[model samples]
Target: MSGKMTGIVKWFNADKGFGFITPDDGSKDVFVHFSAIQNDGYKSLDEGQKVSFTIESGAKGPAAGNVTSL
Candidate 1:
């Protein structure tokens, strides 16, 4: 999970600014934060929506970064 990878948004909460994504490789769900989203404002993810992002070691565990909708 070094480079950007594709995945489907499992769920997201715009208000809470967090969610989970099912990696394309069918790996475990990666934690996603709104700050990682590439959008300028009002960043959010839609359930089942396709996306691309890079994986990095989060403070707790695996987390998604540079998330972009696709």
Candidate 2:
């Protein structure tokens, strides 16, 4: 399942290669990965950064895909 969602970068861990995105609508925290941040520059995300992503049901819970900075 993949659909668009807008959220804020709540947390990130470059060393672990993962993060969490809090949905704008306050639905839930969507987990994010470094690979999902499709950018040409640095491959890391900062807290409080606005972003858009696609939701995917992961083994743990909701996950973020195609996470992009805005």
C-alpha lDDT of all candidate models, in order: 0.89, 0.88
lDDT for model 1: 0.89
Cα distance off (Å), candidate 2, residue 33:
0.6
* TM-scores of the candidates in the order shown: 0.87, 0.91
43-62 in candidate 2: lDDT tens per residue?
77889989998999878999
Among all candidates shown, the one with the greatest lDDT: 1
Give the per-residue lDDT of model 1 (tens digit) for 2-48: 56789999999998999999999998899999999996567999898
* Candidate that would win on TM-score: 2
Score candidate 2 by lDDT.
Answer: 0.88
TM-score of 1: 0.87
Candidate 1, poorest ten consecutive residues by summed lDDT: 53-62
Collision count for each candidate, in order: 0, 0
